[PDB]
Design a protein around this nucleic acid. Structure first.
Ligand SMILES: [Mg+2]
Ligand SMILES: [Mg+2]
Ligand SMILES: [Mg+2]
Ligand SMILES: [Mg+2]
Ligand SMILES: [Mg+2]
Ligand SMILES: [Mg+2]
Ligand SMILES: [Mg+2]
Ligand SMILES: [Mg+2]
Ligand SMILES: [Mg+2]
Ligand SMILES: [Mg+2]
Ligand SMILES: [Mg+2]
Ligand SMILES: [Mg+2]
Ligand SMILES: [Mg+2]
Ligand SMILES: [Mg+2]
Ligand SMILES: [Mg+2]
Ligand SMILES: [Mg+2]
Ligand SMILES: [Mg+2]
Ligand SMILES: [Mg+2]
Ligand SMILES: [Mg+2]
Ligand SMILES: [Mg+2]
Lengths: 283, 60, 290, 128, 98, 95
RNA sequence: AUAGAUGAGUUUGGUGAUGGCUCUGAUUGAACACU
RNA sequence: CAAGGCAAAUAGGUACAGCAGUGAGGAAUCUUGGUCAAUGGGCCCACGCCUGAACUGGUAACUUGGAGGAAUGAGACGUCGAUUUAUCGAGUAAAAUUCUGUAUACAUAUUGAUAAUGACAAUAUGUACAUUUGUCUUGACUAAUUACGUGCCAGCAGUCGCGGCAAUACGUAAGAGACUAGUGUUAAUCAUCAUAAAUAGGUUUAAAGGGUACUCAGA
């Protein structure tokens, strides 16, 4: 005979918990329910963790087609739909793998995709943009900027963000330079100068499009400078790659983090606790 | 170049992060390397780099 | 070998919350106490109670000794900053007065006056606190086996580990057989589709298919592990949530590790069925493990 | 103390503290082997009362120490080679050592069901 | 006698070498005068490559190795073979064509 | 957290409280943790210098939370601003 | 390298001090007992 | 060259702190293997010879890292321990069902090496298999309870202490808390300890102001 505890379980699992046996309505059906900010809560005891919306299927294509077909800079697409540049780049990478599967005549997980997307909140981009997908201007809290400092200054001083950055340290930058899309500040400054919105967007596009050109240039010069140091000498069996380097960069005592060579005067750390023996980087 | 970067690698789309966006603490690397000996005197221009020096010490 | 610690995994008496979609677990989660009594308990009795509760969910398949070293006292967080404010103001107004800012009348006076005083100049939503205490077990969210569970590709953290050890996952298009691989921002881990269907698919009861062979859309295939036509697990809707640090694609069963779990004002990106009071007690335990 | 008084060497190490098991602590050894010289009984001090089973042992180093026999019932006598480990009987003066019960000649308690590791008792092997 | 040779390092069944400039009559793994580069015998395979080709990673300071070769350094048979590929020296051995 | 640093003495029981950055936690003793957890503090450091009497330990810590340096009274007294660098940097009080 | 600084039991009829001892944390080219 | 030990006598060698190994001592630490294929060295015009360094196989949980199985499982309408025969548990636990093929085994291929030479093994892929529990603690410090027996006896104990006939502290039985191919104990080191205080202590009554101050050196 079932115990009392199990009997109570199946009792709750039949009347109150029967709403989770199947997902009939579209949207989240979590236990915590809708919160004060209109976001479901998967755990009632933890109100801070909310189920955030995920990019709808049709929305993922809009982002992909804009960056590929129209060739717009990722920064512009990130600021248009309020999607992080790190997410926009992932949507394209994942979408390119779909083209490969569709090109290779591979069967997609369509039955699993449709059912799961009905359990999560979505944000359809385009016309019906109720709220921004996420915050694209989130700044990382630097450890230096977390200190409680009360600097004594003149009673009539104009303490700006630049001065505050110098108070935390000499090599620190203000939040105006730590943004992922700094072209927005320049765009907002145009709205203060009674500039037509039609022109304010034009300058923004040219700004982002110009920055991506620079970044693409540095990358090209970098990769080209890394291959100039590799002299490939093909052989009968393999290809020997001789990478050049400076044998004098070992520091003033031979201890340099970037030095090349198996360091001397150190035994094997294999018997140390918490020693990592797993690949830390899969290129 | 050998082959194009596929969409699987994280280098398919380069999105450089802004300055001071991480604080990774790398450990101290034990061991040392021998300091290469200086071949030229710190001050002045040595004779080894002048023209014809090699031909004088290694004449055909 | 089943160890003594797994003899009572979903017990209804102890009511532990586990990282799985089991129906016995859903009942223990729904009917979990709102706030365990800690008034009479000493400081050690509270830190232990919080550790046992949180460790039953976070990294349950990880040795306590290993997690003690994985526990980091660095709780990252971000700060939202709109460009509209920066363009207009340069932070000078924040130092007005004596360095802290222009003082405002007390609340018992604003309700008295008819007109409301002018709004203060600052960023939007710049007074709400951030839940740092609830990011204690964020380092566990970096594991490859956990990320597969948070993406809804497996029915539990134990099953997500099987997929890795059994060579069913490939990070950055390369096979990965180590469940402890700490993902890096930008890595794209992809699980085999057949495993994601069986993991999340409904059980295959041979009795139901008996009355099926006789009697878009998908046909019934009796040569597959899951039940055809594929239908999601029974009680999967109650655990269907994808964190914000992941970007998944259900079609190909792949996902990208955009960034590490990061806290924000009024929000945390670490799934945890425990209040900040418990996560705060569990954080103090691992500072000195006593 | 003034900086001068410290320059002349006023900071000296603290007076050493005696160890619970000097014979083992002196040479940094966890245990030693000794030949039982006498198996008698020691009486606790004021608060405690009873007959504590002790054994006068002559260690391999040469020291003659007094070790305590844990458990209920032993099988050692004169000229018994026993293993000595650190410890101390808190109520018996001079009894500053213990004897391992799964040792060379000292046998473990056969009727012990709890803490068998502390008394060197093999598992009963009831079903096996 | 200055020699450009390989100092073997690594673990069991995982050889990793270190091109160095040391005196002939000295321990193989003793601290040398300099460290010209490293050498990995086991050939690697490009990450996203299915052609089946293999390569060997070799870090080498050509500018520093040339000076030592010019003052009378005698590279071993293996180091000589590597320097030949780089084009500093001529091959010491060759496959008979006949 | 508290404003700056406070050091109080109650009959041979000295307590030194320090303000710590966000995300630091209540890395304090077992009695201070209860007071901070009840008052609303979340980041702090403590240290008993001389004695650890349970009672005077709590009396000194309570008198320290009330003897914090008021950053505005220090400004009017010296005639010099005391700018909150963390407030100007982020454009407001980042709780 | 900017997160790193923490206590507990025990003297007294009792309180507050002084001053030891012990536990709490990490570890070993370790040994032993039960496995 | 001298002395002692072993050996040797008209002889006039040997000293394993070279590798493996034996005895002894001790709480305690291994094979009397293979190959010069790789790296290094000596001899050599050259070829080539030699290498107990070295590279490899073996022994030990000594340590570290990893594996050591996941999902389903409610009417076997059984069993077990408590007791309130229906309460409280064992218990989703088991059995059973549906999957995976992890360590490992085997096969194939590449590679360690090239002018040529492979002792031995790694890596990749294919197929196949679901494989143990152990141990400490349970008065407070310190997370975790009752019953019976024992009666300052037997014993427990890191510290305070417990045991004198209704013991939550001993010994059994059950339950509970925790770590896990490890778990405890002993020994040791750091921290705890501002507990020799340079950073950074203190000396009326608590360890500790010299009997005195003129004074060389010295601050
Ligand atoms: Mg005593
Ligand atoms: Mg028991
Ligand atoms: Mg006991
Ligand atoms: Mg008195
Ligand atoms: Mg004191
Ligand atoms: Mg030997
Ligand atoms: Mg000898
Ligand atoms: Mg012996
Ligand atoms: Mg050789
Ligand atoms: Mg050679
Ligand atoms: Mg030759
Ligand atoms: Mg295998
Ligand atoms: Mg040869
Ligand atoms: Mg307790
Ligand atoms: Mg007492
Ligand atoms: Mg008992
Ligand atoms: Mg292990
Ligand atoms: Mg006097
Ligand atoms: Mg005198
Ligand atoms: Mg006197």
């Amino acid at each position: 005979v079932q115990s009392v505890r199990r009997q109570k379980m199946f009792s709750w699992l039949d009347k109150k918990g029967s709403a989770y046996k199947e997902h009939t309505r579209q949207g989240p059906n979590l236990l915590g329910g809708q919160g004060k900010d209109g976001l479901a809560v998967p755990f009632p005891n933890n109100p801070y963790f909310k189920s955030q919306p995920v990019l709808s299927e049709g929305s993922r294509e809009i982002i992909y087609q804009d960056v590929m077909e129209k060739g717009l800079p990722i920064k512009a697409v990130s600021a248009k739909y309020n999607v992080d540049v790190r997410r926009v780049a992932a949507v394209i990478r994942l979408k390119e793998i779909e083209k490969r599967w569709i090109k290779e005549y591979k069967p997609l997980a369509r039955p699993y995709a449709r059912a799961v997307m009905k359990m999560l909140p979505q944000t359809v981009l385009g016309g019906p943009d109720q709220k921004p997908h996420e915050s694209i201007n989130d700044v990382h809290v630097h450890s230096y900027t977390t200190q409680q400092l009360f600097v004594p200054v003149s009673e009539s001083r104009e303490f700006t963000r630049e001065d505050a950055a110098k108070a935390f340290g000499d090599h620190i930058l203000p939040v105006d330079k730590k943004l992922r899309v700094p072209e927005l500040i320049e765009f907002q400054k145009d709205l203060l100068k009674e500039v037509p919105l039609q022109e304010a967007n034009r300058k923004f596009l040219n700004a982002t499009a110009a920055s991506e050109a620079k970044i693409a240039e540095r990358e090209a010069k970098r990769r080209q400078a890394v291959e100039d140091a590799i002299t490939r000498v093909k052989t009968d069996r393999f290809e020997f790659r001789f990478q050049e380097f400076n044998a004098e960069n070992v520091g003033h005592d031979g201890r340099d983090r970037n030095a090349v060579g198996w360091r001397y005067g150190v035994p094997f750390p294999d018997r140390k606790r918490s020693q990592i023996k797993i690949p830390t980087k899969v290129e | 170049d050998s082959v194009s970067i596929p969409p699987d690698s994280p280098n398919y789309i380069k999105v450089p992060e802004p300055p001071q966006s991480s604080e990774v603490r790398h450990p101290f690397v034990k061991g040392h390397l021998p300091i290469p000996r200086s071949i030229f005197p710190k001050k002045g221009v040595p004779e080894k780099v002048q023209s014809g020096y090699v031909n004088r010490i290694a004449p055909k | 070998m089943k160890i003594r610690r797994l003899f009572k995994y979903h017990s209804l008496k102890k009511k532990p919350i586990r990282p799985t979609w089991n129906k016995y677990n859903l009942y223990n989660l729904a009917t979990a106490g709102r706030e365990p009594r800690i008034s009479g308990k000493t400081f050690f009795q509270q830190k232990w109670l919080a550790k046992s509760l949180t460790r039953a969910y976070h990294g349950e398949h990880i040795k306590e000794r290993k997690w003690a070293r994985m526990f980091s006292r660095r709780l990252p967080a971000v700060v939202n900053m709109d460009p509209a404010y920066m363009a207009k103001y340069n932070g000078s107004e924040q130092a007005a007065g004596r360095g802290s800012g222009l003082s405002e009348p007390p609340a018992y006076e604003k309700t008295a006056d008819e007109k409301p005083a002018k709004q203060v100049i600052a960023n939007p939503g710049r007074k709400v606190p951030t839940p740092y205490e609830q990011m204690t077990f964020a380092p566990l969210e970096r594991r490859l086996d956990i990320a597969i569970f948070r993406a809804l590709f497996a029915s539990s953290a134990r099953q997500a580990r099987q997929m890795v050890v059994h060579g069913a996952v490939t990070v950055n298009g390369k096979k990965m057989k180590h469940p402890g691989y700490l993902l890096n921002p930008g890595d794209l881990f992809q699980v085999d589709v057949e495993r994601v269907l069986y993991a999340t698919g409904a059980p295959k009861d041979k009795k139901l298919l008996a009355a099926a062979m006789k009697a878009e859309d998908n046909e019934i295939d009796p040569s597959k592990p899951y039940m055809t036509p594929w239908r999601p697990r029974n009680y999967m809707s109650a655990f269907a949530f994808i964190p914000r640090y992941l970007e998944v694609n259900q079609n190909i069963c792949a996902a990208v590790y955009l960034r590490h779990p990061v806290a924000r004002p009024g929000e945390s990106e670490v799934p945890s069925p425990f209040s900040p009071t418990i996560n705060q007690l569990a954080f103090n335990w691992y500072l000195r493990r006593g | 103390a003034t900086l001068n008084q410290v320059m002349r060497g006023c900071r000296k190490p603290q007076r050493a503290r005696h160890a619970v098991s000097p014979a083992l602590s002196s040479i940094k050894s966890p245990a030693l082997k000794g030949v039982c010289v006498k198996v008698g009984i020691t009486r606790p001090k004021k608060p405690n009362s009873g007959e504590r089973k002790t054994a006068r042992v002559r260690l391999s180093t040469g020291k003659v120490i007094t070790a305590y026999i844990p458990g209920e019932g032993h099988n050692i006598s004169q000229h018994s080679v026993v293993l000595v480990r650190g410890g101390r009987a808190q109520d018996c003066p001079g009894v500053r050592y213990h004897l391992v019960r799964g040792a060379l000649d000292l046998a473990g308690v056969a009727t012990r069901m709890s803490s068998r590791s502390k008394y060197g008792t093999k598992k009963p092997k009831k079903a096996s | 006698v200055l020699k450009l040779r390989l100092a073997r390092f690594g673990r069991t069944n995982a050889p990793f070498y270190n091109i160095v400039v040391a005196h002939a009559r000295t321990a193989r793994n003793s601290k040398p005068l300099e460290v010209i580069g490293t050498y990995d015998p086991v050939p690697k395979k490009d990450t996203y490559d299915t052609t089946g080709k293999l390569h060997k990673d070799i870090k080498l300071d050509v500018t520093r190795a040339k000076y030592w070769i010019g003052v009378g350094a005698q590279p071993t048979d293996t180091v000589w073979r590597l320097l030949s590929l780089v084009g500093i020296l001529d091959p010491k051995y060759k496959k008979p064509q006949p | 957290t508290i404003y700056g640093e406070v050091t109080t003495k109650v009959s041979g029981t000295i307590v030194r409280l320090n303000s710590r950055p966000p995300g630091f936690g209540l890395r304090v003793s077992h009695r201070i943790f209860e007071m901070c957890r009840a008052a609303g503090i979340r980041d702090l450091s403590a240290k008993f210098l001389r004695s650890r009497n349970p009672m005077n330990t709590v009396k000194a810590t309570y008198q320290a939370l009330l003897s914090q340096p008021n950053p505005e009274d220090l400004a009017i007294g010296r005639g010099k601003k005391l700018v909150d660098v963390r407030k100007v940097y982020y454009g407001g009080s980042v709780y």
